[PDB]
Design a protein around this nucleic acid. Structure first.
Lengths: 119, 128, 102, 60, 84, 147
RNA sequence: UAAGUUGGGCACUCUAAGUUGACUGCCGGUGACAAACCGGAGGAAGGUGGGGAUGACGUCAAAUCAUCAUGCCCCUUAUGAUUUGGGCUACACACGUGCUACAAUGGACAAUACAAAGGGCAGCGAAACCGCGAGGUCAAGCAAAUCCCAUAAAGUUGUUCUCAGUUCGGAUUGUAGUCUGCAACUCGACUACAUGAAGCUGGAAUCGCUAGUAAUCGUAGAUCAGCAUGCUACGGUGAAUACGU
């Protein structure tokens, strides 16, 4: 469904409506609004069929799709399959660069358990 | 014709007021009072000089000014006014000095010393 | 603006030595000519150097310093080789930094 | 130690900056100014002497 | 990153040219920090100086996502009792 | 130790407005409170047609304590008249502080509702009045023979 | 005149130098007449006018032998030395400091006004040109009241949003790129796309602050091949309360 990809809410404005699609944010959305010449008007999905088709076919322009999730999959999984220290820190909340984990448990691993071996 | 002229000092600002006899209509930097103040509707307080002194008014005005936010220079306006109305006649001082509006408010900012940082807050202690 | 002219700049770190020296070179300027310009002031730039009274620690109790720098500006019209000598004749005392110019 | 590090930051170098600009007399690197190349304490304890120009202090 | 363009420390290439045009090694020594992979360096067995003793790693064709500059960190289990 | 007044404000012409705006000025943005208050004195007149001073002055009488307590010592607490300065300070203080506690999304609807309900002797402001005046001037017997 | 840009002007602002002024000092009362308290005028500024610097005898056998200096003690084919790479930055957790959040005084888009202070010679980077962008070409002026840093931001006016884990928030991750440095893998900074976390005002306890203060917005610099939510100063808006001991 319905106007593009999957999972759009009805009766919502375009500039936000086209972002629940996994693959678009807020600016590239505005770009595809600039291609098919559509816009909100006003807080709500006014898109009648005559615009629906053009958005329905223009939207193929990008990855958007779950294929982006698979793209991420083979990216990270390749990244650990090869050697690799980058996968080891792909488990540690540490990108190829670094973030200095001492308080970086609660971004990944939900501070529970708390247990301190001081001193 | 003839006009009077006194400066305006307040709050890191400087105003050069030019007091010309007239009906009262004011354009700082050749620009109207409304055209210069956000929002602002406390402008009658700059006409506080005209209610107590030169009652009710009025004189047309010209002025040039720069430095500091809108408030402190909007109230730098007042001092060259009162001074200039005393240039006209020292009659007007008696109702002014029982109201002020002329003592160029000496207070302004304060230096820092350790405790204040990127915004103005002094520090805490180490608890527990 | 176009005109025959001499202009210089001085610099030093004391208003008394600089302004008495200015009195010298103005006096000697119009001594050998005319049309001098007075000792025109300048904003007198500054500096700062914040340092901790410390060897090891205790950054809270900091300390400052500074280096004021007077600046002075003089001009003369209708040059001549004599007021030249009034420039390159007397700077004294010599904490000053003259840069004779046109 | 500090003694051979004087020699370290004195010699030629492979390229532009492996350098550090440390204090002439005091062997401290840190908290040094390029204007004077004097460290933290040393500029102060000389600043009191009435040696470098100049006032110093307390107008800001 | 890189200012246009890719590179090598250019002692590495000078070695591995003579290593590679002929029959290759199962073993190499190096430091290999200012350098990286590109097609000349595949299959050979480099060993970055880990800090203590370089470990042989054999390059793979797929080491485009991974590189030469590091394979086996200095941290090395962990430093901590718990794990990921 | 004295008060250092605020002069007038001629929108709409009165002074309690002047003392009012300053409390709403969260984080030093005086033009925002200026706007939403002034519009509040447009809308309170729009709905329930009347004068701004009728609703405002009447309410800030209705929500304005005149007797009040204070503690000291076991747990005793003197009932105490309110100075006119603190009288209005409490009226406006608890006024805005509960006017927050309504929970609308709109700048001025919450206020017009607040002082136009207060002016009808309803709203948590009036309930605060009745609670303070309940515990006060009901236990007067023990703490009254003092300063 | 695009424009103080130039003729002319130094009136005003200003710039930095010299001096006047505020001292119970003038009046009135009170008070051992005295000290002193209270009030009145004047003045811009009245009772140390605001602030800074300044820190008594000494205390904590407080801190520093790792700024430095140094007694004693110890090392010396190494407790001294050079270099590449590495780490000082780890990660079940707690603690403290600070940042941004938990949205309508709010969020996104557009127009639009007001500063102060400080830095630039092998450094500031103007105009114009390319690029969505960080940035890139290019080169004018600039040892500085000249020119560049450098739009100040908050604000003000408008359009939209109408209460949702939302156009709230902005973590983490992948990709594509910019600069610096040789080289950004441990470990730089940065932009663009996509992601779209916890969280809907905080428990027990607890800290700051008496007016240009708190609260709050941004700017400049040092250290500096690149790198500051921190430090220092800079101003902008700007409050409530002080019954009383």
């Amino acid at each position: 469904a319905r106007i593009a990809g999957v999972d759009i809410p009805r009766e919502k404005r375009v500039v936000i409506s086209l972002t629940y699609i996994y693959g678009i944010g807020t600016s590239t959305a505005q770009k595809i609004l600039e291609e098919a010449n559509v816009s909100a008007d006003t807080r709500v999905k006014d898109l009648t069929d005559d615009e629906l088709g053009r958005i329905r076919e223009v939207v193929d322009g990008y990855k958007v799709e779950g294929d982006l999730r698979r793209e991420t999959n083979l990216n990270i999984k390749r990244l650990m399959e090869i050697s690799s220290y980058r996968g080891i820190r792909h488990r540690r909340g540490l990108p190829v660069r670094g973030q200095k984990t001492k308080n970086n448990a609660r971004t990944r691993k939900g501070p529970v358990k708390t247990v301190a071996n001081k001193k | 014709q003839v006009e009077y002229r006194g400066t305006g000092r307040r709050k890191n600002s400087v105003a050069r007021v030019r007091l010309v006899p007239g009906e009262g209509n004011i354009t700082v930097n050749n620009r109207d009072v409304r055209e210069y103040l956000p929002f602002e509707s406390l402008i009658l307080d700059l006409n506080q000089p005209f209610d107590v002194t030169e009652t009710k008014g009025n004189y047309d005005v010209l002025v040039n000014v720069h430095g500091g936010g809108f408030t402190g220079q909007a109230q730098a306006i007042r001092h060259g006014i009162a001074r200039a109305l005393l240039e006209a006649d020292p009659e007007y001082r008696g109702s002014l000095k029982r109201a002020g509006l002329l003592t160029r408010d000496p207070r302004m900012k304060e230096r820092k010393k350790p405790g204040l940082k990127a915004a103005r807050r002094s520090p805490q202690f180490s608890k527990r | 603006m176009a005109k025959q002219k001499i202009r210089i700049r001085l610099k030093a770190y004391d208003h008394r030595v600089i302004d008495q020296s200015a009195e010298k070179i103005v006096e000697t300027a119009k001594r050998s000519g005319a049309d001098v310009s007075g000792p025109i002031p300048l904003p007198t730039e500054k500096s700062v150097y914040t340092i901790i009274r410390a060897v090891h620690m205790y950054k809270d109790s900091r300390e400052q310093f500074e280096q004021r720098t007077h600046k002075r500006l003089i001009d003369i019209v209708n040059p001549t080789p004599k007021t030249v000598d009034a420039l390159m004749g007397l700077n004294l005392p010599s904490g000053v930094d003259i840069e004779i110019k046109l | 130690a500090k003694t051979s590090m004087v020699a370290k930051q004195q010699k030629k170098q492979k390229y532009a900056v492996r350098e550090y600009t440390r204090c002439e007399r005091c062997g401290r690197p840190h908290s040094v100014y390029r204007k004077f190349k004097l460290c933290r304490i040393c500029f102060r304890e000389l600043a009191y002497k009435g040696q470098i120009p100049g006032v110093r202090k307390a107008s800001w | 990153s890189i200012k246009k363009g890719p590179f090598v420390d250019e002692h590495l290439m000078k070695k591995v040219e003579a290593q590679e045009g002929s029959e290759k090694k199962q073993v190499i020594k190096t430091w290999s920090r200012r350098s990286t992979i590109f097609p000349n360096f595949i299959g050979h067995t480099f060993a970055v100086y880990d800090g203590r003793k370089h470990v042989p790693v054999y390059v793979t064709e797929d080491m485009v996502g991974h590189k030469l500059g590091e394979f086996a960190p200095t941290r090395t289990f962990k430093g901590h009792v718990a794990d990921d | 130790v004295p008060k250092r007044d605020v002069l007038p404000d001629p929108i709409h012409n009165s002074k309690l407005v002047t003392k009012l705006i300053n409390k709403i000025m969260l984080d030093g943005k005086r033009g925002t409170a200026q706007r939403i208050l002034y519009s509040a004195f447009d809308l309170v007149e729009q709905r329930s047609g009347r004068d701004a001073l009728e609703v405002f002055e009447e309410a800030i009488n209705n929500i304005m304590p005149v007797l009040e307590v204070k503690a000291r010592r076991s747990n005793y607490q003197v009932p105490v008249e309110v100075r006119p300065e603190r009288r209005t300070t409490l009226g406006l203080r608890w006024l805005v502080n509960y006017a927050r506690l309504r929970g609308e999304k709109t700048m001025e609807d919450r206020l017009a509702n607040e002082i136009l309900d207060a002016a009808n002797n309803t709203g948590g402001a009036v309930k605060k009045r009745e609670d303070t005046h309940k515990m006060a001037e009901a236990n007067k017997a023990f703490a009254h023979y003092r300063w």
